[PDB]
RNA sequence: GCUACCACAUCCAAGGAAGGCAGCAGGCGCGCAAAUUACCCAAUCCUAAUUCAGGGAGGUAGUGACAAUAAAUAACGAUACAGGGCCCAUUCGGGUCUUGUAAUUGGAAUGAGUACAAUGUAAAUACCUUAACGAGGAACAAUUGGAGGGCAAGUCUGGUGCCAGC
RNA sequence: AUCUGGUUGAUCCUGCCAGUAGUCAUAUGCUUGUCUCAAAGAUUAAGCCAUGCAUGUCUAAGUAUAAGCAAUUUAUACAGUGAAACUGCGAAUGGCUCAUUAAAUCAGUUAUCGUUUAUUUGAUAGUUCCUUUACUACAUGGUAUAACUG
């Protein structure tokens, strides 16, 4: 999440991956892509890197609640704004969130003497004295040795996440294609990895801006399941 | 590793803490000379009680004994050179009756008030601390200098202080920048 | 106004590196700390030498202003002063240029992975260009 | 350990070199060479802690690589070559010639000598033996072997060595009433003359030595280096000339000399 | 450095193949109990075929109320009203004092802090030096423990015994 | 070179339990403005360990036909620089911990006429074709492999 409107999180990504000891991972993935799946061949882990669009606001509010680590970027040229930056910080912690990392991308703008680039960190501690008494560091990604234990922690840890979203099951899509069953109703194939506790053929599934739709079958591709006739009242006003 | 760096502790507290005939004579030295706490008075009894111990056993061994003559005539020579022993008391038995204010009267806080520079003993320790007094050419700012004897006569003000020299401080400059420009308006 | 007085004490004639070394002492009442550009250009005419053949270092200013003590020395050719003086003193004087390499951690990890290739490695290139081609 | 040791820590360095105990963590360790370890002095303690010519280690190697410094008419570049007793250190671009000899308080003294005394060197006699093919040799205290000597030389005598060709001019015997330097122990650096020498069979023999101010002392036999007959040494002695001054006598002799 | 068994534990296309932090930084363990995955070979010294390359040995900073040294948090006046006070004392006040206090009044000094420069240093950070800035200080505000006895310090008012072994 | 409270109605004793100071002696509680100097995963578990580093090295002077570069030029054997690899040397020093170990270690002290030793420093080698110069080179004998191409 960028916290000011003029930021390049793709460049913040390219400040997070220069210290990863491959080379040909950043240059081919530039054109128009907001989802990335990358395997880290040092700590032996795979990551699902997402980045939403700042022009919309509602998309920001759910891209947090799918995840467990939230990279909080800051700015070395301004402070935060109340109605849009500070409120969106107050937004996510009140609806519930897992852990996070506050971070700064660039510290070129303050003058190249050293002590002036020191205290500007201490100013940026301001929103982690009254917001959170649980995080005291801000990692300068221009430093190569601060940009590595931000890679150590997300590849090797996982925090206490939320209660309610965890205990029901939730899948993110990777490949969505439509196949035909009938002109009254067809079928969508959804490729993904199940998180939460799972998805079984005795209840329903809601997706926002589309709503509720009834499954038919479950296939795990390296267990072929179907939907029985024990459905509920698939209506609005149940008789 | 590396070599280790020596240090030492320089005072010592007393055995009985609350007994009243001690507590007053310490008080009347702290008001007479203006000392901050009683750690400053323990500092002068420690240094004394090793001088007294050092002469306390050269007296035991014989006279015309070449350790008495080399270590005696140096201890005597150092106490006169700062000016505690009297010049007619150059005998080894006379240091065994030395007292604690015979060092207290040689500090810079005490030797600048007697020499006519400050109107009180508390006008000394604030004159020294603020870099005003300069024996020789050197601004000192320690109220416990223990001035050597042949340099009692060099103390004066400093060639940088506003008292004995150049530009006034940033009140008078600020007051002149509050009135002289305000004379027109 | 300012008597910038320059003493030069404890002088030693050193022909084994072709120089003179001496303790520089400078009095400066009512000023803060005369800089190195002056103290290098001052001593040249006192010793009849080029500006580039002199160098100074290590200046501590006494407790309470007024003076500064330290060290300086001077060779009898500019050819010697590029030959003998350490190259971080030469880069102070605008005389030698800064080399630019990787940091100390990036050229340690770089040599630990050229410990795995017995040879030039060109024969290894056409191998993976064969198998990883398909 | 498993092999030889190769580092010398700073507090374990020999005391009369006077390295200050805060500058580093290790000291120079002397190489294997002519003189023993705790009885010698490398060329870096000479050229930067005594003559103050060099200010680093990197400056000493710059001096040694220009092939200036010789010992005994031979060039050395080993930055810890072990120069010891009675060695001659001939710089060239100053025309100075030095000789290593002892102080009185127990130190290695800076000593300048002429350009003619720097052509020879004494040395005592550690053993005399019959070598292979029946020729004899002689071993000095710095380790020079020299074949074909005179038969009248015995052990503990003193030879004179010509540094040019490595040969012998003449020699001095060892008996009562000779001039003697003392090169090890407590009375280290004092010069006196022989009273007599008693012998213990299967033990360490003791000499009795009288000073010039006629006060006597006793040392073992091996710390005794013959110099010449009485009143006439063969080398240029330092100031003080090996006279022990009591600490009482040298405060006031410093006091009255303090007139500058 | 390698090889065996013992205790361990890592990757695997299941055919196999690899491993020893009581070196330096850092781990999720334990317990009353102990710092940064930072910068460099400038010094100290060691090694090599060697002046040049290498060195978490070693140096420099960050974190550090483990211990030890030096010592800010106020100093000077005026009147005022008191007393004591030495004396002019006639008796006044004639002098010398000392305080006491008067949200009675005045002006001088200065570094904690900030910060052009220079100096420091391998490069920097800090300490020494120094332009401009920086106080009535009521706010630029010292704290821990006690006030029968041992053992310095209260005959003071308030609880229905709010908030009693002490 | 020092002592004070507590057994009885009252007093003298034996006698112990409080008190009182120190600690380069570790934790812990509340506070905390300045300069100099600085220990710091020992105790319990010599328990277990993700990732990166800590040991390599070339001079005029052992081996260069790089299909390297520089080209620059007196040089038809080669000669400037110089990757890879063979040969030589080092990796047995340093750094860390304190589990074992009670005549063992270790200290001050002897002995080697009882032994091995890279290196460094100083000496040291006409005799060795069957021969005293008779076949069979001393103006100089023989294969094998590395990097590299495929």
UniProtKB/Swiss-Prot annotation, chain A:
| Residue ranges that the Swiss-Prot or TrEMBL entry lists as coiled coil | none
Localization, per the record, is: Cytoplasm; Nucleus, Nucleolus
> The Bms1-type G domain covers which part of the protein?
1-160
| Highest rank taxon of the organism | Eukaryota
Q: How does it assemble?
A: Interacts with RIO2.
General function of this protein: Required for 40S ribosomal subunit synthesis. Required for normal export of the pre-40S particles from the nucleus to the cytoplasm. Its subcellular location and association with pre-40S subunitshifts from mixed cytoplasm/nucleus to all nuclear in RPS19 disruptions, suggesting it acts after the ribosomal protein.
Q: Miscellaneous notes for this chain? A: Present with 1390 molecules/cell in log phase SD medium.
Family, according to the entry, reads as follows: Belongs to the TRAFAC class translation factor GTPase superfamily. Bms1-like GTPase family. TSR1 subfamily.
What is the protein named?
Ribosome biogenesis protein TSR1
Species annotation = Saccharomyces cerevisiae (strain ATCC 204508 / S288c) (Baker's yeast)
Shown portion of the complete protein runs from: 89 to 351 of 788
UniProtKB/Swiss-Prot annotation, chain B:
Q: Specify where the region named Disordered lies, as residue ranges.
A: 159-185
Q: Which residues form the signal peptide?
A: none
Write out the entry's keywords from A to Z.
Cytoplasm, Isopeptide bond, Nucleus, Phosphoprotein, Ribonucleoprotein, Ribosomal protein, Ribosome biogenesis, RNA-binding, rRNA processing, rRNA-binding, Ubl conjugation
One GO CC annotation, please? Answer: 90S preribosome
Entry GO MF terms: rRNA binding; structural constituent of ribosome
Q: Domain S4 RNA-binding: where? A: 106-180
Q: Specify where it is mainly localized.
A: cytoplasm
Q: Which SMART domains match?
A: Ribosomal_S4, S4
GO BP term (any one): maturation of SSU-rRNA from tricistronic rRNA transcript (SSU-rRNA, 5.8S rRNA, LSU-rRNA)
- Pfam families, sorted: Ribosomal_S4, S4
Cross-link Glycyl lysine isopeptide (Lys-Gly) (interchain with G-Cter in ubiquitin), residue numbers? Answer: 179
Establish whether keyword Ribonucleoprotein is in the entry.
Answer: yes
Residues recorded with modification Phosphoserine: 183
What InterPro entries has UniProt attached to this entry?
Answer: Ribosomal_uS4, Ribosomal_uS4_CS, Ribosomal_uS4_euk/arc, Ribosomal_uS4_N, S4_RNA-bd, S4_RNA-bd_sf
**Subcellular localization, as worded in the UniProt entry:** Cytoplasm; Nucleus, Nucleolus
The record's similarity note reads:
Belongs to the universal ribosomal protein uS4 family.
| Subunit note | Component of the small ribosomal subunit (SSU). Mature yeast ribosomes consist of a small (40S) and a large (60S) subunit. The 40S small subunit contains 1 molecule of ribosomal RNA (18S rRNA) and 33 different proteins (encoded by 57 genes). The large 60S subunit contains 3 rRNA molecules (25S, 5.8S and 5S rRNA) and 46 different proteins (encoded by 81 genes). Interacts with snoRNA U3. uS11 interacts with MPP10. Component of the ribosomal small subunit (SSU) processome composed of at least 40 protein subunits and snoRNA U3.
What more does the entry say? Present with 106000 molecules/cell in log phase SD medium. There are 2 genes for uS4 in yeast.
Q: What name appears for this protein in its UniProt entry?
A: Small ribosomal subunit protein uS4A
Swiss-Prot record, chain C:
The organism sits in which domain of life? Answer: Eukaryota
Phosphoserine: which positions carry it?
13, 55
N-acetylserine is found on 1
Q: Where is this region: Disordered?
A: 101-134
One Gene Ontology biological process: cytoplasmic translation
Mod. after translation: N-terminally acetylated by acetyltransferase NatA. Also partially acetylated by NatC.
* Matches recorded under InterPro entries: eRP_eS24_sf, Ribosomal_eS24, Ribosomal_eS24_CS, Ribosomal_uL23/eL15/eS24_sf
Q: What else is known?
A: There are 2 genes for eS24 in yeast.
Q: What is this protein called?
A: Small ribosomal subunit protein eS24A
The lineage, from the top, is: Eukaryota, Fungi, Dikarya, Ascomycota, Saccharomycotina
Swiss-Prot record, chain D:
Q: Does the keyword Membrane apply?
A: no
Residues recorded as bearing Phosphoserine in the entry = 31, 246
The terms under GO molecular function for this entry are: RNA binding; rRNA binding; structural constituent of ribosome
User: What keywords appear on the UniProt entry?
Assistant: Cytoplasm, Isopeptide bond, Phosphoprotein, Ribonucleoprotein, Ribosomal protein, RNA-binding, rRNA-binding, Ubl conjugation
The record's function comment reads: Component of the ribosome, a large ribonucleoprotein complex responsible for the synthesis of proteins in the cell. The small ribosomal subunit (SSU) binds messenger RNAs (mRNAs) and translates the encoded message by selecting cognate aminoacyl-transfer RNA (tRNA) molecules. The large subunit (LSU) contains the ribosomal catalytic site termed the peptidyl transferase center (PTC), which catalyzes the formation of peptide bonds, thereby polymerizing the amino acids delivered by tRNAs into a polypeptide chain.
Native source organism of the sequence: Saccharomyces cerevisiae (strain ATCC 204508 / S288c) (Baker's yeast)
Q: Name one GO biological process term.
A: translation
Q: Which residues form the S4 RNA-binding domain?
A: 41-104
A cellular component term (GO) from this record? cytosol
Q: Where is this cross-link: Glycyl lysine isopeptide (Lys-Gly) (interchain with G-Cter in ubiquitin)?
A: 61, 133, 160, 167, 173, 178, 210, 232
Family per UniProt?
A: Belongs to the eukaryotic ribosomal protein eS4 family.
Underlying gene: RPS4A
Highest rank taxon of the organism: Eukaryota
Q: Where in the cell is it found?
A: Cytoplasm
Q: Major place of localization?
A: cytoplasm
Locate the Phosphothreonine modifications and list their residues. Answer: 114
Question: Would the keyword Phosphoprotein turn up in this protein's UniProt record?
Answer: yes
Q: Which Pfam families match?
A: 40S_S4_C, KOW, Ribosomal_S4e, RS4NT, S4
The family database entries (InterPro entries) matched by this protein are listed as: KOW, Rib_uL2_dom2, Ribosomal_eS4, Ribosomal_eS4_C, Ribosomal_eS4_central_region, Ribosomal_eS4_central_sf, Ribosomal_eS4_KOW, Ribosomal_eS4_N
Q: What is this protein called?
A: Small ribosomal subunit protein eS4A
Q: Which HAMAP family match?
A: Ribosomal_eS4 (MF_00485)
State the remark under miscellaneous: Present with 573 molecules/cell in log phase SD medium.
């Amino acid at each position: 999440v960028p916290l000011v409107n003029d930021l390049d999180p793709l460049d913040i990504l390219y400040k997070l991956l220069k210290c990863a000891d491959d080379e040909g991972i950043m240059v081919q993935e530039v054109d128009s892509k907001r989802i990335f799946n990358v395997h880290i061949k040092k700590f032996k882990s795979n990551l699902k890197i997402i980045i939403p669009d700042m022009t919309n606001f509602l998309n920001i509010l759910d891209c947090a609640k799918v995840a467990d680590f939230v990279v909080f970027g800051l700015s070395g040229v301004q402070e935060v704004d109340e109605e849009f930056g500070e409120q969106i910080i107050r937004a996510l912690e009140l609806q519930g969130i897992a852990s996070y990392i506050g971070v700064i991308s660039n510290l070129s703008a303050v003058h190249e003497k050293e002590k002036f680039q020191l205290d500007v960190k201490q100013s940026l501690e301001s929103y982690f004295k009254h917001f959170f008494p649980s995080e005291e560091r801000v990692y300068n990604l221009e430093k190569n040795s601060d940009a590595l234990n931000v890679l150590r922690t997300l590849c090797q840890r996982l925090p206490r996440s939320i209660n309610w979203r965890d205990n029901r099951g939730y899948v993110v899509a990777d490949f969505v294609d439509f196949v035909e069953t009938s002109p009254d109703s067809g079928d969508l194939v959804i490729e993904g990895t199940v998180r939460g506790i799972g998805f079984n053929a005795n209840r329903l599934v809601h997706i926002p801006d589309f709503g509720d739709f009834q499954l038919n079958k479950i296939e795990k591709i390296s267990t072929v399941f179907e939907s029985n006739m024990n459905r509920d009242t698939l209506d609005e006003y149940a008789p | 590793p590396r070599a280790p760096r020596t240090y030492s502790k320089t005072y010592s507290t007393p055995k009985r803490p609350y007994e009243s005939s001690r507590l007053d004579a310490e008080l009347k030295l702290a008001g007479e000379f203006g000392l901050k706490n009683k750690k400053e008075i323990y500092r002068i009894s420690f240094q004394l009680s090793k001088i007294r111990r050092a002469a306390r056993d050269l007296l035991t061994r014989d006279e015309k004994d070449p350790k008495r003559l080399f270590e005696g005539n140096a201890l005597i020579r150092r106490l006169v050179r700062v000016g505690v022993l009297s010049e007619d008391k150059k005998k080894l038995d006379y240091v065994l009756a030395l007292k604690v204010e015979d060092f207290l009267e040689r500090r810079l806080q005490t030797q600048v008030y007697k020499l006519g520079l400050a109107k009180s003993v508390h006008h000394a320790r604030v004159l020294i601390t603020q870099r005003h007094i300069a024996v020789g050419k050197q601004i000192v700012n320690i109220p416990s200098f223990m001035v050597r004897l042949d340099s009692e006569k060099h103390i004066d003000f400093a060639p940088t202080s506003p008292f004995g020299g150049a530009r006034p401080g940033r009140v008078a400059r600020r007051n002149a920048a509050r009135k002289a420009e305000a004379s027109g308006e | 106004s300012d008597a910038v007085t320059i003493r030069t004490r404890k002088v030693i004639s050193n022909p084994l590196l072709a120089r003179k070394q001496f303790v520089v002492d400078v009095l400066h009442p009512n000023r803060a700390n005369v800089s190195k550009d002056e103290l290098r250009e001052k001593l040249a005419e006192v010793y009849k030498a080029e500006k580039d053949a002199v160098s100074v270092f290590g200046f501590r200013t006494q407790f309470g202003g007024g003076k500064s003590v330290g060290f300086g020395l001077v060779y009898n050719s500019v050819a010697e002063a590029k030959k003998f003086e350490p190259t971080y003193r030469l880069v102070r004087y605008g005389l030698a240029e800064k080399v630019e390499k990787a940091s100390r951690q990036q050229r340690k990890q770089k040599k630990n992975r050229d410990k795995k290739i017995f040879g030039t490695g060109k024969r290894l290139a056409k191998k993976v260009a064969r198998r990883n081609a398909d | 350990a498993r092999g030889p040791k190769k580092h010398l820590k700073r507090l374990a360095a020999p005391h009369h070199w006077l390295l200050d105990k805060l500058s580093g963590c290790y000291a120079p360790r002397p190489s294997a060479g002519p003189h023993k370890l705790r009885e010698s002095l490398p060329l870096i303690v000479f050229l930067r802690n005594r003559l103050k010519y060099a200010l680093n280690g990197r400056e000493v190697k710059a001096i040694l690589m220009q092939r200036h410094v010789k010992v005994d008419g031979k060039v050395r570049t080993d930055t810890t070559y072990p120069a010891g007793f009675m060695d001659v250190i001939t710089l060239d671009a100053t025309n100075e010639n030095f000789r290593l000899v002892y102080d009185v308080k127990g130190r290695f003294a800076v000593h300048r000598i002429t350009d003619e005394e720097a052509s020879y060197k004494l040395g005592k006699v550690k053993k005399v033996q019959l070598g292979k093919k029946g020729v004899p040799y002689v071993v000095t205290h710095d380790g020079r072997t020299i074949r074909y000597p005179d038969p009248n030389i015995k052990v503990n005598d003193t030879v004179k060595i010509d540094l040019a060709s490595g040969k012998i001019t003449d020699f001095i015997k060892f008996d009562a009433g000779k001039l003697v330097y003392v090169t090890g122990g407590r009375n280290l650096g004092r010069i006196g003359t022989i009273v007599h020498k008693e012998r213990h069979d299967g033990g360490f023999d003791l000499v009795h030595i009288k000073d010039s101010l006629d006060n006597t002392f006793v040392t073992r036999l091996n710390n005794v280096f013959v110099i010449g007959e009485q009143g006439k040494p063969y080398i240029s002695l330092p100031k003080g000339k090996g006279i022990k001054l009591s600490i009482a006598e040298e405060r006031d002799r410093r006091r009255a000399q303090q007139g500058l």
